[PDB]
Amino acid sequence: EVCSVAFLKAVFAEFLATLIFVFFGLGSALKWPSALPTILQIALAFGLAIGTLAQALGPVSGGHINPAITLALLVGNQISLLRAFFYVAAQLVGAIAGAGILYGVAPLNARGNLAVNALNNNTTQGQAMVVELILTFQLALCIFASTDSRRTEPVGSPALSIGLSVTLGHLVGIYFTGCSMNPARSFGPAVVMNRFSPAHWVFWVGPIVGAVLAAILYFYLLFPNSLSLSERVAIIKGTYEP
Amino acid sequence: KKEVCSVAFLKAVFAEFLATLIFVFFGLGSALKWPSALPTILQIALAFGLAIGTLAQALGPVSGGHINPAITLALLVGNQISLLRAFFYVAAQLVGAIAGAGILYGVAPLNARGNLAVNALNNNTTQGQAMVVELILTFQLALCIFASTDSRRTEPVGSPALSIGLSVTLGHLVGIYFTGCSMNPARSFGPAVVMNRFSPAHWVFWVGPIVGAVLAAILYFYLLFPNSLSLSERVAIIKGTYE
Amino acid sequence: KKEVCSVAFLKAVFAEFLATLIFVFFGLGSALKWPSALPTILQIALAFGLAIGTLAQALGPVSGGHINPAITLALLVGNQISLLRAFFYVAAQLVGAIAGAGILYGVAPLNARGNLAVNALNNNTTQGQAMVVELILTFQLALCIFASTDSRRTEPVGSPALSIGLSVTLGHLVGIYFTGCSMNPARSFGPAVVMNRFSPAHWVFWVGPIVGAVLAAILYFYLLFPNSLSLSERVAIIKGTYEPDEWEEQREE
Amino acid sequence: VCSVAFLKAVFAEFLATLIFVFFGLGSALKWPSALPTILQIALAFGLAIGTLAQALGPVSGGHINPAITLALLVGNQISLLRAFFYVAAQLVGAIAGAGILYGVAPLNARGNLAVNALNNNTTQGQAMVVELILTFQLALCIFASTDSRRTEPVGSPALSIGLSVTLGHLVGIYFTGCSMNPARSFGPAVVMNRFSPAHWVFWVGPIVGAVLAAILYFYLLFPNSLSLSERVAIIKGTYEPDE
């Protein structure tokens, strides 16, 4: 699995995409002096960044760009444990790259905090944890319905469908935590500007738990695969034919 | 007599509960009176509609994806579903819709609470003038739901869930300006359950959607594109004993 | 003669009445001068284009779904419909537009009703200018509608209604700063009759869209993607008889 | 070149780039009635590509962008002469679209005919790197959407490509007014006759970014598997596979 050429491209796509998703998301959501971006303006910019990069590099990788989605798929028994590590690693590296790039290009009067995930003052950690859970649970459940081959119903454009599920997440999430759902999107500018949150665990735990719940529902409860124990073991190592 | 014993039904009812819940949370949540930056009309419209259009793509394959008692009844009135299904489905939708606003209650900050974005009248416009519009909104929506769930279509549908989502966004682009846009009893009931009794124009948000949805269910499923079946099988549907 | 008296054609023009009722109801309804919060340019444009795009999906299989006498009278010149199909459609679109505009006045209160989202020129844009815009605003819309609904298309069309619907929106994002964006003569003639006001340049709102749509047909149908049919076949279409058909139903095998 | 299909294709590149530059620039004028918002301008520019793809895409390929034309020629999808006359058509079409706007636009809203303006806090070097990333991502979507080898559900190539221009504009506006299109930069620059010393960025930025995406797509990521004779034949303009 790991030594093949398809595995090299697939992981590169996750790095490359997460770079651009983070560059465009953060770049669009800076406190620009020309005109401070609106809540819709931001929410579409992320959900067009996910919807565009799904269409481009979803053939190459799978189009995760998201540790939570990757980990949800892993817990759902959709991917190998080796993949999960490299994908997640590529995403986390890519996010730092994209954040890093933005640091260079943007003028100071815009830059500020590089659009890090700021928790709202009236909002708490335990409150913001349940939001990032939901925000990512619907995105996870949207993805898995949109890219299950067993579906007979008309999917249409799962690129711009999954894309818009991000824009849905941002029009609520901007208020509670500045929106995250992607642990890499949080971890990117936190490393570049070199400043973590006290509630940075929320941006990991919330989405990673939120996404895994969707996977537990969709892949075991609602739409089971019906495979033997030894069939499932070979999938996680990376030796499934079928 | 029967369609309940199957686990496919058990999943289908829960999927409505689960779906209806999230639509409310995101609809209301996007609609809350945010002091950080109050939501524009276009914003609230998109967030409401993209909630439906995503949930259709997610749980439409599991439950049909009504996410609304108006469509649940207008599918019973159009002869698309049995009695015992629409009994449990609206039972799921309302139960779900309560939990969804109640979680927004359980998380939202007190400065942004505002109203919990509940449906409330315009002072310049009467209860009659508002009852007229809730027909129009759910009519065109149900017409578009029924048209895009019709398997007979040879025309290129392309994207069902996004076109249904953009119908709900079209619904709010004008329907916010009157009552806050119901197009949905569970969306207007669920949050208003956090109080006690009925408000002044509460009947408007039940009759308006259910009537509107049924007029498309007459026009589409009886007049425009009928079915041509016997009363032996039309009764077998309503019981739920059809193959 | 038989084409008209069939039960298929009853629903085929009734849907144009019901569509243009709902289009000019929703479209104009988002563009009122509201007190609560004045609708933005992007908020208007989307509501018009999504009205088109939501109706074209729902009542596309019924009538085809023009919801526009500029579009219908371009199909007649492009040789896609009969002369009695084009006549009865245009009537129901203008009757629908006035029927919708009538229902809109009946709910919108004193304060908000205002001028009922009627079209009007920009103060620095003359009649010599404003017609050239409304041509191009609708030329592009026709070209999208033709290429999206043409069954000769090999490429993946996607969703045809939304693709078309968001060409109306795109028309509004420029059109409002010149006219309030008509692109549809019925959407001008819908409110103008109800509130009982016509301008010194209402000739721009009729001729501009229809001419733009018809000049797209000359390009698309005759230059870009030609037909290859005889003069007898062209006259057969205009009068309203053409074969072969598909799935005529009935027996026997 | 002498063929009838080439005429229509080159004419459609003129006509589309003309209609693109009209709709692109006109939505972002100094409108005294109501100044255009940022999301509005992104959606205007974006949907012009997402509509002219649907219409004139079948005719020409739906380039409307000398950077995308040159990227494909490097990636090995067209002949030398096809690109030459495509670029010429786009650049002329752009000037026509702008020179058309000179007549119809009023004086009070006019502005500078909406030419790309480099944010004066940002340098030449930085603007180039954004314009690269704006156009690299645009082209990298295009090639995947328009790839006939695609097994995945394609969606509407037209719409997903138009929104990559929207996405492009959501960030690019703050740096340059967003170009990603040497003709859209050149077009209004000839009508008003206003060339900055920083005009080279609008050519070099998108072109370099588009070339990288093509090289990455067609050679590295998704290989072709064809001989040099077939590749030279594509550059010279002589090819016909299957029936």
JSON list of C-alpha atoms in Angstrom, two decimals, chain C residues 170, chain D residues 19-20 23-24 43-53:
[
{"chain": "C", "resi": 170, "resn": "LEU", "atom": "CA", "xyz": [-26.09, 37.44, -12.67]},
{"chain": "D", "resi": 19, "resn": "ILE", "atom": "CA", "xyz": [-19.62, 39.25, -22.28]},
{"chain": "D", "resi": 20, "resn": "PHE", "atom": "CA", "xyz": [-17.37, 38.24, -19.32]},
{"chain": "D", "resi": 23, "resn": "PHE", "atom": "CA", "xyz": [-20.56, 41.52, -16.62]},
{"chain": "D", "resi": 24, "resn": "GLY", "atom": "CA", "xyz": [-17.33, 41.33, -14.60]},
{"chain": "D", "resi": 43, "resn": "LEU", "atom": "CA", "xyz": [-20.45, 36.25, -7.26]},
{"chain": "D", "resi": 44, "resn": "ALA", "atom": "CA", "xyz": [-20.81, 38.54, -10.28]},
{"chain": "D", "resi": 45, "resn": "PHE", "atom": "CA", "xyz": [-17.35, 37.77, -11.75]},
{"chain": "D", "resi": 46, "resn": "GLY", "atom": "CA", "xyz": [-17.68, 34.09, -10.82]},
{"chain": "D", "resi": 47, "resn": "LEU", "atom": "CA", "xyz": [-21.10, 33.42, -12.34]},
{"chain": "D", "resi": 48, "resn": "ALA", "atom": "CA", "xyz": [-20.06, 35.09, -15.64]},
{"chain": "D", "resi": 49, "resn": "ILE", "atom": "CA", "xyz": [-17.57, 32.20, -16.05]},
{"chain": "D", "resi": 50, "resn": "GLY", "atom": "CA", "xyz": [-20.18, 29.72, -14.74]},
{"chain": "D", "resi": 51, "resn": "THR", "atom": "CA", "xyz": [-22.70, 30.90, -17.36]},
{"chain": "D", "resi": 52, "resn": "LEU", "atom": "CA", "xyz": [-20.44, 31.42, -20.42]},
{"chain": "D", "resi": 53, "resn": "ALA", "atom": "CA", "xyz": [-19.17, 27.89, -19.73]}
]
